[PDB]
Structure 1
Amino acid sequence: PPSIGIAVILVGTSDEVAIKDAHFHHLSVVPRVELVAMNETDPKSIITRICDLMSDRKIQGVVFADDTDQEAIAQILDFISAQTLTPILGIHGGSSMIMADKDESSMFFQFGPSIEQQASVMLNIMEEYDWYIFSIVTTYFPGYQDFVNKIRSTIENSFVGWELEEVLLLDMSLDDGDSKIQNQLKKLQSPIILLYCTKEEATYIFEVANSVGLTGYGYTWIVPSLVAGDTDTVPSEFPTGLISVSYDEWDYGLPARVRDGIAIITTAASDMLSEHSFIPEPKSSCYNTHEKRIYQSNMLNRYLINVTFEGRDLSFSEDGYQMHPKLVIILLNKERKWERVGKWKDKSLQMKYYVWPRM
């Protein structure tokens, strides 16, 4: 059986031996994995590294993991994936932080929940504890509309007496020297607040909300994965009592993720070669994608999204996120540690507390 090249790119991470050991393949094709270590996660470092790889070897696919909170990394990877038409899986870190509106030509897929799935978990949580009155705060971070829309459409088709009191839209592309974000937050009355933004955006917003008295008792803030991010790094502005939905290396370890990443790409290419008697030729160069585009496509996507491995459904949506991930609900407790307080699993919620302990 012929070999296809797969790059595994690890930023800031040394479970390197544990990873090579977790990775078996009975198919039409076998992987030749190449572990690559990166130090930097700016646009130039990421683009040139991946493009060097593609030019020095024949890469059918990239499995990418990082140890940062940098959601931009996902944006960069989608761009690289769309331009080179190369499968990239962002399985951990900034690489897995939701990238809403991926490019039409993207072959970029992310471990972790969609925005809509997280919005839906957040409303389930609120239902459990009969928190029915709430408000929303977002920035302009992409996804913010999907978030608000999903909420609005869930609650407007519901016998439950939801009361969405206020939706704030904060512009943090401008400086805050006129205290406009203070002025906007002052308007908030609701006891529950859903916040969609980036981790760095959240730490400023929390800093301001604290100053106007919105983070204490009788306010409970709920946030998605990308705000908690790496749960070993906890900004001091984050208020105790913060609830978040999380897919940050809990029960699904990096070693296992890299294994599943390799399987998804290897299986997809096997399935295609079976049905069509070819796979797409690894791009020789990203420095001439303009010439060679009429010869490329994202055909491999339709296979990439419908893989099962060791008797496990690893499906992605077409929109490029994990289909039904087991999510972990977490709470920032009196010790400023993130604490497991629930699971979302088989589309059911299971919470630890019947009544929230003191913050």
Structure 2
Amino acid sequence: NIAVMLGHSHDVTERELRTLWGPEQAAGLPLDVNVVALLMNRTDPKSLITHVCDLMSGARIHGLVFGDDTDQEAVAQMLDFISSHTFVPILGIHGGASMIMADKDPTSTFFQFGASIQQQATVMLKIMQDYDWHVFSLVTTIFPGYREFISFVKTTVDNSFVGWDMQNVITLDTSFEDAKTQVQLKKIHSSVILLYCSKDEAVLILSEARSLGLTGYDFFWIVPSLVSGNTELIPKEFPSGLISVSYDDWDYSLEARVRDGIGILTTAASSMLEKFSYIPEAKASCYGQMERPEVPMHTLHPFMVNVTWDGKDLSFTEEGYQVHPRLVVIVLNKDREWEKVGKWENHTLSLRHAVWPRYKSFSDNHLSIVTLEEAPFVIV
């Protein structure tokens, strides 16, 4: 059972070496299972459908741990559709099957382990309050999820007692030529700016804003993912020192992600056998469908939501939210690269910088007072 599909568009570090060990390890859940693997090429709907259907000829009680490398957004949705009308739980790992989609049909079973936008906003609020900035604006543009983004930000701001100063909400949606953009840009005067746009929109907004002067030596931009790509492909007009958060790929390698997926599948099978003592199959046919109604026999839905592995726990919930994602915070480097400061491991940030390095924006009274405790003059 359990088949994994790949094909090494970029990382050719695979071959038969990937199909090594897995469920054997020290796991005490043995049965008639294997670690069957498969390689492929660039994905098109016809080719992808045919390949997954062909794999359904033998993957009777199996699953797929497919991963991609491109940036085509519809890949996740097509995976969701296949998972829906096949009853085969699957997961997503790299790139295309890594951007979490908002809603899924209930009669579906797959859980990509990315991170929700709300989680990003929570981590960003945590880091902002950690540096005690509080006052900030929320300039944005028109793009899907902007409304829920704004509402969640507002509700999270209001539901605490630390006193954030909420002002200067800008939601320009009228191209970038009229006076509304100009007055909206001129109105803001704070030092903490939070943006949310889509790639070229963000770069155009920043290119307009630099000409106003809001890109001085005492300003911050905390853009949420969006303009991050999957590499050091920052646009040349991105000045420097852009604060961002993103999913981790350097402290987590695919060789371990595949192992974690295999372990999750095996643990789910062990739980099902411990609770149902029998796991059926669904290898009737991929094609020639619409021949049978629903059959809730051994649905994986209740057997995965609270599953750990080797002590480490990464149990999911409802949507593809993994409760404990390995988000990492990065900054733009002087040499146009991404740094690595702090890692969201626990609810604590665990940052590395005691003070901010004051990154040079484009290509003064704070001093160091020193004293020690003594007498009723300085008290520790």
* Paired position in structure 1 for 2:278: 278
Instruction: Please give the secondary structure, in 2, of the residue aligned with 1:125.
Output: helix
Q: Assess if the C-alpha contact under 8 Å between 1:63 and 1:91 holds in 2.
A: yes
Residue by residue over 1:134-159, the C-alpha shift from the partner in whole angstroms, topping out at 9 and shown as x without a partner, is 233264335x4443333222210122
* Paired position in structure 1 for 2:319: 319
Find out whether 1:202 has 2:204 as its counterpart.
Answer: no
Pair member with larger Rg = 2
* Paired position in structure 1 for 2:100: 98
Instruction: Please give the secondary structure, in 2, of the residue aligned with 1:62.
Output: coil
Instruction: Please give the secondary structure, in 2, of the residue aligned with 1:66.
Output: coil
Find out whether 1:14 has 2:12 as its counterpart.
Answer: yes
Instruction: Please give the secondary structure, in 1, of the residue aligned with 2:107.
Output: coil
Change (3 A) 1:211 1:223: closer
Q: Assess if the C-alpha contact under 8 Å between 2:90 and 2:110 holds in 1.
A: yes
- The offset of 1:129, in angstroms, is 1.6
Change (3 A) 1:165 1:45: farther
Residue by residue over 1:309-338, the C-alpha shift from the partner in whole angstroms, topping out at 9 and shown as x without a partner, is 222112111222222123211112121111
Q: Assess if the C-alpha contact under 8 Å between 2:90 and 2:111 holds in 1.
A: yes
Structure 1 stretch 282-291 or stretch 271-280: which is displaced more? 282-291
Higher helix fraction (1 or 2)? 1
Query: 2:290 is aligned with what amino acid?
Result: H
What is the count of residue pairs matched by the alignment?
349
Instruction: Please give the secondary structure, in 2, of the residue aligned with 1:249.
Output: coil
Change (3 A) 1:310 1:354: same
* Paired position in structure 2 for 1:82: 84
- The offset of 1:227, in angstroms, is 4.1
Q: How is 1:223-302 mapped onto 2 (pairs within 5 angstroms)?
A: 223-225=223-225, 227-295=227-295, 299-302=299-302
Q: Assess if the C-alpha contact under 8 Å between 2:84 and 2:107 holds in 1.
A: yes
- The offset of 1:269, in angstroms, is 2.1
* Paired position in structure 2 for 1:126: 128
* Paired position in structure 1 for 2:368: none
Find out whether 1:186 has 2:188 as its counterpart.
Answer: no
Q: Assess if the C-alpha contact under 8 Å between 1:225 and 1:248 holds in 2.
A: no
Residues in 1 aligned to 2:119 and 2:338: alpha-carbon distance in whole angstroms: 21
Q: How is 1:27-46 mapped onto 2 (pairs within 5 angstroms)?
A: 27-29=29-31, 31-46=33-48
Residue by residue over 1:190-234, the C-alpha shift from the partner in whole angstroms, topping out at 9 and shown as x without a partner, is 53333445xxx2233222331232555444222344642413443
Residues in 1 aligned to 2:183 and 2:49: alpha-carbon distance in whole angstroms: 39
Q: Assess if the C-alpha contact under 8 Å between 1:10 and 1:65 holds in 2.
A: no
* Paired position in structure 2 for 1:307: 307
Residues in 2 aligned to 1:170 and 1:82: alpha-carbon distance in whole angstroms: 38
* Paired position in structure 2 for 1:337: 337
Percent identical: 51
Change (3 A) 1:115 1:294: same
Residues in 1 aligned to 2:82 and 2:180: alpha-carbon distance in whole angstroms: 34
Change (3 A) 1:212 1:114: closer
Higher strand fraction (1 or 2)? 1
Q: Assess if the C-alpha contact under 8 Å between 1:240 and 1:334 holds in 2.
A: yes
Q: Assess if the C-alpha contact under 8 Å between 2:242 and 2:332 holds in 1.
A: yes
Residues in 1 aligned to 2:330 and 2:123: alpha-carbon distance in whole angstroms: 12
Q: Assess if the C-alpha contact under 8 Å between 2:86 and 2:286 holds in 1.
A: yes
Change (3 A) 1:178 1:45: farther
Change (3 A) 1:268 1:335: same
Query: 1:149 is aligned with what amino acid?
Result: S
Q: Assess if the C-alpha contact under 8 Å between 2:199 and 2:226 holds in 1.
A: no
Structure 1 stretch 58-67 or stretch 264-273: which is displaced more? 58-67
Q: How is 1:203-218 mapped onto 2 (pairs within 5 angstroms)?
A: 203-213=200-210, 217-218=217-218
Instruction: Please give the secondary structure, in 2, of the residue aligned with 1:49.
Output: helix
- The offset of 1:238, in angstroms, is 4.1
> What TM-score results when the alignment is normalised by the length of structure 1?
0.84
Q: Which has the higher contact order (CA 8 A, sep 6+)?
A: 1
> What TM-score results when the alignment is normalised by the length of structure 2?
0.79
Change (3 A) 1:274 1:246: same
Query: 1:32 is aligned with what amino acid?
Result: N
Residues in 1 aligned to 2:237 and 2:88: alpha-carbon distance in whole angstroms: 39
Residues in 2 aligned to 1:188 and 1:284: alpha-carbon distance in whole angstroms: 64
Instruction: Please give the secondary structure, in 1, of the residue aligned with 2:51.
Output: helix
- Give the gaps of 5 or more residues in structure 2: 361-380
Residues in 2 aligned to 1:316 and 1:350: alpha-carbon distance in whole angstroms: 24
Q: CA RMSD in A?
A: 3.1
Q: Assess if the C-alpha contact under 8 Å between 1:132 and 1:162 holds in 2.
A: yes
Instruction: Please give the secondary structure, in 2, of the residue aligned with 1:63.
Output: coil
- Give the gaps of 5 or more residues in structure 1: none
